[PDB]
Amino acid sequence: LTDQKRESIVQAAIAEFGDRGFEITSMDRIAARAEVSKRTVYNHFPSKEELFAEMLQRLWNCYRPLVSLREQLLELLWGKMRNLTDSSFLDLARVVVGATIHSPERAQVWLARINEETFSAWIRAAQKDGRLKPVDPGFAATQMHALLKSFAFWPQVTFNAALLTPQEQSNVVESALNMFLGWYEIPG
Amino acid sequence: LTDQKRESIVQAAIAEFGDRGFEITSMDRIAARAEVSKRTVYNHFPSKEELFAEMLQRLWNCAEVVYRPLVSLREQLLELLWGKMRNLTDSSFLDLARVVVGATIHSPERAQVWLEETFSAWIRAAQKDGRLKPVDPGFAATQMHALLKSFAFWPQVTFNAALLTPQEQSNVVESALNMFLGWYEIP
């Protein structure tokens, strides 16, 4: 159960920022298409900053004893792939990237907020159990993420590429897995 | 009376685009930085879209590269990665790369028209030579780039993250190499 009127306003924000661009889009233009009163808009978000803050949070927001690393890591990779293959997520991603790319102040809120995650937590756990090779958990997670995002995120965000078909999806997951564990696994 | 002028207006546009982005930069803003009339710009680049095209040409101009059967895969592939990382760690290149990335997200219509190959041909040659497992070269090239771009392209271009340090640059190059050949190489 989430709040459907918040979502209404967020949705219109995405659409409008997608249409007009972020900085030229006003709270009343948003309200006009949320089909809401300027008033109920300010209640939820007192400013575009506070609204941008919420969109950001939403964005990059999306280890077991001995079941095989493979089995459990397959499952992780699928979780992240199912999230990437959501067009409402790609949309938000697009407007957020679009809003930060040529905006220094917005870049510095991105980058202060990307200094405080799942793949990382696991790699560190897998390492303590002596099943993965010593490396900075964050260094390893980035590669992990890159092996998926390079097919299922960036093309879509930058070029409006199609979603991956399921065949394509497991294809990319599978080689990511194979490549990743290939290099990092200490075999037990 | 136009030798200077073309280049001067392409330099203008590169500086202005690099600073505020492709979309928000308008023609007589470029005309101003280039110190020429708006029509003077408008008859060199008949449209803003001819600017974007030229922006690509430039980006491309920063890009051996042929496959050598007689030496290690690692030698030649370290060389490719490092050539690719040398552009990645070049601020002019990232700026130019940023305008281009920004211009296609901001425009569904030009992204749609405007879709690396160096690596994919090196891969298919290596596969012919029996040294890499069968894989779509395109797909494996994408993965190779992702291992560099994730550290040294996307952060910098989408949120002006700091360039990688020399140490960091040569760790992501080593690691990509190891990761890639670990899985793909037929030794």
| CATH 1.10.357.10 residue ranges for chain B | 56-187
What residues contact A3, with CB distance under 8 A and at least 6 apart? Answer: none
- 3-state class (DSSP) for residue B23: coil
| CATH 1.10.10.60 residue ranges for chain B | 1-54
B interface test, pick of A92, A139, A149, A158 with most B CB neighbours within 10 Å: A158
Resolution of the experimental structure, in angstroms: 2.4
**Angstrom distance (rounded) from CA A40 to CA A53:** 18
CATH topology of domain B1-54: Arc Repressor Mutant, subunit A (1.10.10)
For B112, which of A104, A151, A160 is closest by C-beta distance? A160
| CATH 1.10.357.10 residue ranges for chain A | 56-188
Both tokens assigned to A13: 């924000």
**Experiment type:** X-ray
Q: Name every chain B residue with its beta carbon within 8 A of the beta carbon of A101.
A: 21, 98, 101-102, 105, 157-159
**What CATH number does the domain located at B56-187 have?**
1.10.357.10
What residues contact A1, with CB distance under 8 A and at least 6 apart? Answer: none
Both tokens assigned to A10: 């967020």
A interface test, pick of B148, B157, B159 with most A CB neighbours within 10 Å: B159
Q: Are the C-beta atoms of residues B163 and B91 closer than 8 Å to each other?
A: yes
Nearest CA in chain B to A184: B179
Q: Measure the N-to-C terminal CA separation of chain B; round to a whole number of Å.
A: 60
Q: Please say whether the structural domain A56-188 has been given the CATH code 3.90.1640.10.
A: no
**Angstrom distance (rounded) from CA B67 to CA B76:** 8
Both tokens assigned to B171: 């760790």
